[PDB]
Amino acid sequence: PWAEVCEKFQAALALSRVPYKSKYSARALLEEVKALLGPAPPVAQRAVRLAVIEFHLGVNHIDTEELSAGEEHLVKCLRLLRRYISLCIQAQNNLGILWSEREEIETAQAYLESSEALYNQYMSKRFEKVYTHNLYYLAQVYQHLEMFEKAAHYCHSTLKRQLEHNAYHPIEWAINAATLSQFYINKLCFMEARHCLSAANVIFGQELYHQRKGEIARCWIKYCLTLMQNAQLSMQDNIGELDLDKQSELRALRKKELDEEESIRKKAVQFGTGELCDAISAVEEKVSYLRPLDFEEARELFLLGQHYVFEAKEFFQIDGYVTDHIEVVQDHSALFKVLAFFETDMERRCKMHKRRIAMLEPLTVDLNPQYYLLVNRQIQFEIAHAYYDMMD
């Protein structure tokens, strides 16, 4: 009655999928399976089958992970597994999270490392999934280990596999780019970061339905902010009209070739297999921006395009964060004019100043004693009048 046994297994299996809804009877099924271990009695493969059963019995022994006996059983299973398919590393990973509970990171680390090594040592749905799950688990570990860059590497590879397959959702993509941006900003790899949000711009082809756009625009602002901060490598208050004393190399073939060498890695992000790489290629027009000089006009236009989005986000904010983001844009706008170190232009100052006044009034809505919130706004006026002083 081998099949009948397998049917009982099947049933139990289905029941494992199924006022307690679990344990009560599931534990009986655990034992029912053990009862079937009886009947189970080449033999080597029998043992393999049995080991798998024991894996599931170990899984049955969880109960909020209180059943450490199950842990022991899994260890016993591991031994049996080590004697000589991929479930074994899945199980290993399950042991890894128990070490996490036991704070034994190092062993869990080793487990995960070997899980990957074994795949690589080797060389229609499960693998695709768990492969990336493992990377996720590693990232968590890395957080504790502070392996910053490795976690980042994995992030990209999970997005990679996501791209390989059809596991998509536009918002998630957008926010992913949002985080990646900042990462590379902190790492100063601006030139790579360039493709990230712009990659999301490709994604844009398909509540947050409309609101999501502003978050994106915020990030676009941040790009530009950092780019100006890059300009701040050479500070105006220690120089006169002279600058760019440094080398040119703004079109260096040196940089081109070295980037070609580096971009062997970088370009992996272009998982558009030509088609979307072409979409990206259209987008590359803006990705091309690197170390510009007299393009302040263009710089402001970059804002403008996303300023329109900003305006929409104002529609999407409840007269609170509206003013918070206006602050951002105002300063940002002023900074573009800061870049434009020319005498005949204080109009932006005036333009944003008008906004400052309008933004002051809202204290009527917020009469909480938000002293420093107001002080910040007052500081913005300090700055405004400091800029007046700057002018005169």
Residue numbers in the entry: 5 to 22, 32 to 54, 86 to 128, 135 to 173, 200 to 282, 301 to 486
Quote the paper.
Kinesin-binding protein (KIFBP), which is mutated in Goldberg-Shprintzen syndrome, binds to and inhibits the catalytic motor heads of 8 of 45 kinesin superfamily members, but the mechanism remains poorly defined. KIFBP interacts directly with the motor head of Kinesin-2 (KIF3A), Kinesin-3 (KIF1A, KIF1B, KIF1C, KIF13B, and KIF14), Kinesin-8 (KIF18A), and Kinesin-12 (KIF15) family members, resulting in inhibition of motor-microtubule binding both in vitro and in cells. Collectively, our work describes the molecular mechanism of KIFBP-mediated inhibition of KIF15 and KIF18A via binding to and stabilizing a conformation of the kinesin motor head that is incompatible with microtubule binding.
In the structure, KIFBP occupies the microtubule-binding surface of KIF15, sterically blocking access to the microtubules by KIF15. The adjoining loops on each side of KIF15-α4, Loop-11 (“KIF15-L11”) and Loop-12 (“KIF15-L12”), accommodated the repositioning of KIF15-α4 by facilitating the extension of KIF15-α4 away from the body of the motor domain. Whereas KIF15-L12 remains extended in solution, KIF15-L11 is positioned away from the motor domain and binds along KIFBP-HP4a. The structure showed the shift of α helices KIF15-α1, KIF15-α3, and KIF15-α6 away from the core of the motor. Thus, KIFBP blocks microtubule binding by sterically preventing microtubule interaction in addition to allosterically altering the KIF15 motor.
